[model samples]
Target: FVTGNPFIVNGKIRFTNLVRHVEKWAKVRGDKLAYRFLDFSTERDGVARDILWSDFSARNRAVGARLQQVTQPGDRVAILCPQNLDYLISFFGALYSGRIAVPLFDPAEPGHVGRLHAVLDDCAPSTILTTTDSAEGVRKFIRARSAKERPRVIAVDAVPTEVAATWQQPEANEETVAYLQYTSGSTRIPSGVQITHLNLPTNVVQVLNALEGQEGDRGVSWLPFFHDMGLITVLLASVLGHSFTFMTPAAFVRRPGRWIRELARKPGETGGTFSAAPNFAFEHAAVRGVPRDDEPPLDLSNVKGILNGSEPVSPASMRKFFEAFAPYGLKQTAVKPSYGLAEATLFVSTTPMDEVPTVIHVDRDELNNQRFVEVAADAPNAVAQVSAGKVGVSEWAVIVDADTASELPDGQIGEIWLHGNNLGTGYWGKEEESAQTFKNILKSRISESRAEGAPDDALWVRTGDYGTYFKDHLYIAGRIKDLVIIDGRNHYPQDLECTAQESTKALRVGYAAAFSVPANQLPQTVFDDSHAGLKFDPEDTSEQLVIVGERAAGTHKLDHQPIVDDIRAAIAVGHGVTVRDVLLVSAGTIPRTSSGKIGRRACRAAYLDGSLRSGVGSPTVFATS
Candidate 1:
């Protein structure tokens, strides 16, 4: 038995750590289905393969034994495979052997080698687990590296099941480092967050408590296991007794309806279905409706929760999903808007189940001025913002003034500060950066305390995200780093990007990045054969709002002027701001983080460095009209 008491689920004491939990399940429910891998590709005839709890445990223990043969308990092991069952086995295998697991993207993916190398340099893993298909690429990439010690590459699928018999349990406790979750934001400077054994289990409990998760609940997901949400919420939660069905992200990308269809067709014994996705997934699925003759009607009435998170939740996207699936028995209350990050161990707060998320209309001007004044939904200058719900019992979140480090009132936008047991200790190998980001404190401005019973100097994790607390609900505004300040008024880059996307059909939705640059730094010419001229006053020193958008596929030939004019008009009328430049680039040109967020700072750097491939439009000066 482990040192601490076992984690309880549904009024029963389960295993303490994730490894023992799996072991117990394997012993008691060996024949029960644990996972189903859906492959849409032709190689598998689009059949879903099932893995029982016994098989899952055997494969994981086999991999664990193989890892223990070469590496010590405290050593790091990297899992670099595409979304598949093998990935899960290797991930748990590291934990089983007490080796810190590092979930990483495949280096073979375009533009991912740099990130993979950076992570390898940081953690210095002794072994890397990958599939046979990716083994060659992983080896070549590692061989080119200049590191003194190279990690041994092991193909997880090649490990024989007989090795499980030799697997030995290793020492583990709450303080044991379970894995390193590398931030997906930056490739050049990757920071791996040190997630301890306690962090993972505590967060799992928090998630279950918030969702009221119980036995017989079924989950279906297409989120990649490499991500924090997928690792903890979908994969780890399922291993801890919540049965789940999942498909690769590629499968869902190829056919978004497949995710919905899987949830709609749950096992006969399950009561309600649960799933999670980012806002883009819902928008994509809503836009790509099910084909008329592809399948029969879906019965989504059993779906209890469809968690929408991992990115800024779009009210329009949520509405589109509800309207599109209403005829298929999807309820409006099934949508649960939530918020979380890798630093917090994947879950912070989620809207209550069976409750429609709260959407508030705020005065745009007042919000830009750092206030959250509510206005009627139909009122002029009113913008709809969705609430990310309240924090769990073990977690506390406060909106803090970034400049003052003081907790703000309920109706003011500021940086989100969180304190919870589930939060990771710090970043791997970066002490100064970790301290600055994870050890913040909130000094109360008034005698009336905002955080009840908490001292003014309690430690808080600086989320860097901008949001507010309104009517006891948390509303995420945007990223503080991505806030665009023009003419002394604060502007959220996402808001401007949303406006630009709404104005032009040529622009690909969710791919636009808005930021600010000095007027003198604007490029003089657009990337067109016509050499479209940009006219700007050399004396005008006011900061200029730059909108970089990607042209949707099949929009090859276009008169860029209309799109540019529409964007300018939208910003001018909607945001009370002027657009100095509108650069339309080809699809996939805009740099994005691994988690699919637009890298605004990176895009700005590229734009200023003359590296952005953009279609320059005729520059028109905005002067009141």
Candidate 2:
């Protein structure tokens, strides 16, 4: 997946890091727009402030120079700035000064301060980058570390212009770690994946190659700057020399349609527009991202590649998105569902550009049996799954049997193992754990029939994600860690979570978790807080299904029994299994991983440890016997 000079040559790269790319673009198209921060709060119509290559180059150069005064090269710098120009500049500034950047969120971000502190504890940075306005919260964050040395705080919003002249190049190479990406670990302690200089550029080129993205096309992204897809597709798109626009993630959450509105607007004299988001955004845009009656219909004809990834891609969601926007000249071929993770540096596979995304109907019963059986869409036991597209020519991904470590044939489910130059080196400071995940050597069952020297050499990164190859396209089956088993049948939690969202009005989308616990542990029959203590056998026998969903806003006055009944019935009808208990709690009761994925294992752990409860009388948390 590595590219050559001009981003196409072999053996060497023209631009070594993001700093060099910015420097190159600043010299060539200094006055051209490099990035734009669209502020929807300050202005009624939305205020878009542009930052040209020259402006970005000078600003980060000054900020980088300021960092050099207090910190040496290779020192860790935590970028806790809010999502805006400052956040982008702060990150580049760290790289510009050859500091290993830990991209994180602000301390004041609602409810995520705990997670921020969690990451801070891991990557003990020497400097904290923020704005003057954010200093109060930064100080409060600083006070939390009473025993440790206070990290030097630098406010990039007020850096002097003269500091740019003092900036000096720090010696570095492609192997130098640029940023520490902490995206996974809802099941365990979150670990930062080491993203090196070559990792970013390699994945950027691979993404462009797979998605068929052109340098002539501009982009828009409202993904969080701290997350992989959010930062990479937009920020690195700029580094790859494309004019990109960004909006606050808060704006998109408040009104998902605002993103659709942004898409309707013209690109900056580019060929076409492209954007990427998780699967939920596709459904959200279709439902609420519609234009108001008084306004003109959106023109999305010019939109080329709409990348849907991160979570499980729903076939119905993509269909609904195309149907909703089709009136505005949306093409069926525009929606591209892909697969990737933080370990892979963001992108892996996407539907070939200008091709209709593939959706295959398979026997859900067979799927639960860990076997793939293609069936008609109208078949009673059929389940529709969208394809994550094909891996690019240079990239490699294979389905491997989790227990035996042997490669599985197509149409069989197994954990996804990836091997290539695009993968991140490993987790930071956790060599033992890293080797367990990133250094598993492949054991091919077909070794006897294939190559002579095929016994345990190349290392493969265990994705922990279970997927299958069907018709040459990779189809994600379920998460290996979070797979819910009941009556010896496998159930993807995402499948049941979506069902609960669609079946009951009390629950909101993307706010549910479904998992399984040993049947003897949880109380049988409909129970309350006082009954949570019911326990049985010492030895584990069978696992019972559990579903927990967050109540939607304005549902406080509604009854819980009817909603709970609806979810149980829906899951039985849809997935052919009875749910042991249905939990409908207040908003934010359920937990999510750092990258916004539903944390099933964490939710299950919380349920067992007396932290989760559905309110009726007292808290009804289950006990771990």
Candidate 3:
């Protein structure tokens, strides 16, 4: 039995000593299949390969040895790859070599290339692991940097056959840095977060405990590795917990239905456990794959744990997923909506396994005006959403007033803060930034032993998420930075979106985004007089507009449909809200960060420049009251 930090295996009391624990699991689960990789080039043609635990360990060791020859301990190695066995091997190899792994998203996606380049510049990695397929592109992307600025690119699939047999066993301390995960930077440019070995192992155990995961459990995920959910839950957790994982980051994006099909393919698999996706993934599957009336229900029977996170979990999305899967024996309790961030080692809070996700319906006006009101579930105009549950065993939680930084009473909304073994140290190399983020609030009772009057629970890390606590459980509201304000009322983009989704069948609700823009771009107000002499465009001085982007499956335009009318009508009817403008964008054009939050700032910038649509005046906008 594990104690101290009982959630983690190997009796690891803190995150610092987790590598030793993972090594133990590697030895025990050596010959078992650790991961299966689907070849995107051939998946549609039915070709794939599984990597056994022993092979995975050996490859990790060999790559570690090879990397050690090139880099010293504590050097950074960046991995640029889709979800595949090699991604895991290379990442683990970096960890085993006592180097930090920085996983970058594939450059194919929008906004990823720039962010990847920014991270590369920030972290200054010693090497990069890429596939032969990506070598040329990576070269072009890194060419202009100084020689020292360019990391040595090692092709994972093209490693010399002889190197496959080579192995390295480096001496590692628990305090050694394990990986660097960049913030999804949904609001701004991405920032790097440095997580140590201790952080990874600490959070892995907590997550495993939350899911009640067991050895040999089969895990499946379509989440990208560069994101916290995919890296920690699917990759690190699989190794530390001796679980087998089937991965397909791209397949899930191309066809989300494949995720559940993979889960249902095997029984006695202890229910496929996976993590981290925005609410829309389920919503899309429900609308596009499962029919509402016929309900060709998704087979969630084999899914043991489904963690909905990375974005706000819409009540509409949760209900749709639940209703779609109910025909196949999917228990409501199996649906676990969670809240986490890269700073907290991927997992912060999770609902108990036996309890289905619970949501509180709040009157939109009371929530917006009164600030802390909760209404009955059935109240009219009440917006509902799944709760993100309680703090994990390895973590502690608190809700503090965002402005005051003081703790709030139960049921009062505030910014969430956490402290425990699972929190990551801070951003890489940005000391001032690190100091700002990694804070100390109070001392623990045990740690108070040294001071004359040290208070217990001395320090806690401040998470920027806005939320509330009820009956000891945490419910996420939104991000403080993501809040949209227009005409003096505090509006939650999520709340607006939830209502928009419910108002019309023509609207793909969860796919919509509502964000505010300036009504008047006066030099003082819009540019802070920085461009003091520049005159404002008369067209830009119109009433503040709320731009809503909705995804259509194919080449269909979001305008010319009932969606815009539905959204405008719903907001007016439900919240007595009126916006000057509402425009619908194409399916994939609306910008989304890695974690799936709508990139409103990016969209606003794009829209103002007339760069949003394919052609002029293509997306129709509605002016409503």
Candidate 4:
């Protein structure tokens, strides 16, 4: 069935590239509905807009023609618009005209202008594609730049009809640059991941194989198209798999129920539905409640998969969501914890569909000591971590000792490295950075013992993530750069943050950051009886834990001592680490990446600079005694 399919192309019989598959499908299924965009900007009433394959293809051609008029092939084009038809058309326009597309969030968002400007300065795009509503903002953002630095801006909707009518396909191949996907930085600055036409289709196939995707499967997503997960899931994967349904990220945030409601509809006709979201969304839905009194109980039995990724998958949050939705026909096996980043196109590994996600409980002491030791769940220092699953076909995942550049054994935590066709070429414009990131190779020390035969110069991409392999399953610990070392033991910041969030009701989950600061710089109160007798070298200047949590709403009036004490005790018990300082900050005070993961480095910088806004009388130091 796969061999003779029109969509099949390339050497592996997969779709050649995004543009080829889309254009071919349009001709074959002109009248069939291709996409349904749910507009939820209106508060109460939402309008659904449908586009047939023919019309969608025509609009793309029109946008392509307009782009052709203003720019040359291989020229860069920046897309700065919200999740709308205009944005999709403009993106496809760039692809059709062989212009490199750079997808970015709308400049209207707070702090996005700076990121956009940085990207513009790097790529030096020849044109900026945006909608009428966002054109003025885009223009204002570039107003300060020199005329030579500025690019021509065009609104997709304003393209002349004649231009589209005469549109023709440009000469292109799989190796051509497709789009530049910016990384979602949690602990560092964002860099543009340079994806080629080959990378896009290869990753699509890889994801499909990992997920066991079937024809006629429906995809429903509310993730912003500007992000890699959202773009690959909604825009590309749907075309490769089947039809897709999408709502704005705002829509999902405003009413989390809308996503479940959509999933519960037309299951028989669509075969089954799949969706993807970060761990926070699941927690948000469970905490806020999915179905209202006026709404019907959702039947989620038809859901083929619900990918939990783009951030650390919280075992506690996953359980809460499953328990809350169990009565609504949600299955425990449907939750798939996956891992991927912009550098790898989008999807890397995902737990098999219909299989319960793997959760392993290990000795916290061992993990803190950089050793992975299995322990019973009831063990005193047991830490529960969810597995991100095994690597897919045509991909290899390895946990390597970062400093030694040698592959580590199973059950040993170290830097995660990936080798696959899905890997992006490199970063845009930054040659040295690209060489450092993309040209890494595994040293030949332990090749004989490795399961996957490693050559002397086997190229790999450094993921900067810390993880381990246990019985062929991948378990992520945290980011290597964000690790907190206290008393010669390694502690993951997320683990500390998770412990703090679970310790008290006052703190908000997913809004806390735990990092290390100089021991002497900590408040004097932290050196009380609990830590008074601990051995310390006066000249060592050792690091200590600093937990900054956002106080939940209505928590300002409550006594903060118990909350502070609880966090300290939790961290002490969970990881055997003493928290030097605990700051209960105001809600939304912790900086985060656009994808909603905590920005530890940014938060640390703000804390050290005394610029982070805190709760009333914040910086409540726990009594060490």
| TM-scores, each model vs. reference | 0.90, 0.89, 0.85, 0.91
Taken over the whole model, the C-alpha lDDT of each candidate is 0.78, 0.77, 0.65, 0.77
**Tens digit of per-residue lDDT, candidate 3, span 1-625:** 2221344445334434444555676678788767766555565634567877777666776777688788876678998765577778778777766777898855544445667777877788888887777777766666767866567888776665356455555655666667888884433445788787667767776777777775445566667677788777664447434444455544565555666565553544443554456676777666554433543444566667778887877766788888876776667876788988888888888888888887777777766752556688888888775678867774777776545556666666767777776788877777776676677553222221111132354456778777776666678878777677766777787787667667756544555667666655322343332312234566654335464655445545334335556666777778766644555666556666555556676666766675764533221111000
What ordering of candidates by lDDT runs from best to worst? 1, 2, 4, 3
TM-score of structure candidate 1:
0.90
Q: Please give the distance, in angstroms, between residue 77's alpha carbon in candidate 2 and its true position after superposition.
A: 0.5
Q: Name the candidate that leads on lDDT.
A: 1
In model 2, state the lDDT of residue 623: 6
State which candidate has the highest TM-score.
4
Model 2 whole-model lDDT (C-alpha atoms): 0.77
Cα deviation at 526, candidate 4, in Å, is: 6.3
Clashes of 1: 2
At residue 426, give the lDDT of candidate 2: 87
Q: Which regions of candidate 1 deviate over 4 angstroms?
A: 1-16, 43-45, 184-187, 236-242, 267-270, 445-450, 453-457, 526-542, 614-625
How big is the positional error of residue 561 in model 3, measured in Å on the Cα after superposition? 11
Please tell me which model should have the higher lDDT, number 1 or number 3. Answer: 1
Q: Model 2, range 1-625, lDDT digits (tens) per residue?
A: 2221256546222336668766877879888888888887676468888898888889989988999989976679999988888998899888888889998988776545666777877778889999888978897878778556679888898898779999987666888888999965633467899998888888877776665556566678888888899888765467445678888876776677778876764734546678898886787778877788898657888788789999888887788899999988778888888989999988888888868999888887788777789999788757778899887544678888868888887788888988766788888878888888889877674533211232358778899889888887888887787888777678988878877888877887677899988865665444453322334555866787888887786565758667877877787887978777777766656766555566677688878776777433221111000
